[PDB]
Amino acid sequence: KTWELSLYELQRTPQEAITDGLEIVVSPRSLHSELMCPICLDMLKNTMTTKECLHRFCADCIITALRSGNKECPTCRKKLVSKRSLRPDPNFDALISKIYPTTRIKITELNPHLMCVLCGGYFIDATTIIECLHSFCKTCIVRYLETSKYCPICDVQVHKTRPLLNIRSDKTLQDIVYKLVPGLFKNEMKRRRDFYAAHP
Ligand SMILES: [Zn+2]
Ligand SMILES: [Zn+2]
Ligand SMILES: [Zn+2]
Ligand SMILES: [Zn+2]
């Protein structure tokens, strides 16, 4: 895939964090499409992630379907490499252990799981390194990988030559951010509209 950054993506401004503690509500019916396992229909327990498509399942659930199936992804029906294609998602389990309830949550407890260490703000076009499952903004990690072939956090090697081969868009994670953070999807889409209304 061409990781070309648009005119907006080159001059993109971070989405600043909301330090002033706001409490957001989380219903069990909402946030259901991203936190439930599409095999057991329960919330993810010991989350596993596919390197080819970034789809999350339970550790016991995905292992069951692979030993008795076509070694495909149960969601997108893409071909696996049968083994060493599944890496556990530890930072995803931490996010699950924060939001399993039906009460309201302080955003300051959720910010570590929704912020990019490269821009210092919320995730916009969340991209994930499929080797260590560390997520950043699309503009941040692509801008970053022009100079380094290693992860900004755990410092593992992304790829031997072309680091863009081992990154992938994390649509499931980005959908959690736009739903948790109020008005983020509205502000981010207006930022793009204001830019293209002044640079036609
Ligand atoms: Zn499951
Ligand atoms: Zn998949
Ligand atoms: Zn960023
Ligand atoms: Zn990493």
Inside any domain, residue 103: no
- How far is residue 112's CA from residue 115's CA, in Å, rounded to a whole number? 6
Residues 2 and 57 in one domain: no
Write out 26-93 in H/E/C secondary structure: CCCCCCHHHHECCCCCCECCCEEEECCCCCEEEHHHHHHHHHCCCCECCCCCCECCCCCCEEECHHHH
What domain count does the chain have?
A: 2
Q: What's the gap in Å between 127 CA and the centre of ligand 3?
A: 10
Experiment type: X-ray
Residues 70 and 37 reside in one and the same domain: yes
Does any domain span residue 106? no
Q: Which ligand is nearest to the CA of 177?
A: 3
Tell me the two tokens of residue 134: 């560390």
Ligand 1 centroid to Cα of residue 74, in Å, is 11
Residue 84: which domain range?
Answer: 32-98
Pairwise CA distance, residues 13 & 38, whole Å = 35
Instruction: Choose among 147, 144, 91: nearest CA to 114.
Output: 91
Spatial CB neighbours of 115, under 8 Å, sequence gap ≥ 6: 17, 121, 122, 123
**42 and 9 belong to one structural domain:** no
Ligand 1 center from residue 139 Cα (angstroms) = 33
Residue 108 lies in a domain: no
* Nominal resolution (angstroms): 3.1
Cα–Cα nearest to 90, from 120, 49, 123, 141: 49
Rounded to 10 degrees, the C-alpha dihedral 121/138/51/71 comes to 120
Instruction: Give yes or no: residues 89 and 49 share one domain.
Output: yes
CA of 18 relative to ligand 3 center, distance in Å: 15
d(CA 49, CA 71): 14
Phi and psi based region of residue 70 (left: phi greater than 0; alpha: psi -120 to 50; beta: remaining): alpha
**Parallel, antiparallel, or unpaired: how do β-strands 56-58 and 86-88 relate?**
unpaired
State the CATH number of the domain containing residue 184.
3.30.40.10
Task: Choose one of 98, 132, 150: the last residue of a domain.
Answer: 98
Q: Kindly give, in sequence order, each residue whose CB lies less than 8 Å from that of residue 197, ignoring residues fewer than 6 positions away.
A: none
Residues 15 and 41 in one domain: no
- What does 170-189 look like in DSSP terms, one character per residue? -HHHHHHHHHHSTTHHHHHH
Residues 49, 6, single domain; the answer is no
Q: Which of 195, 47, 188, 200 is nearest to 113 (CA)?
A: 47
Residues 47 and 57: their CA atoms lie apart, in Å, by: 6
- Among all bound ligands, the one having the nearest atom to the CA of 152 is 4
Ligand nearest to the CA of 115: 3
Considering the domain boundaries, does residue 146 fall inside one? yes
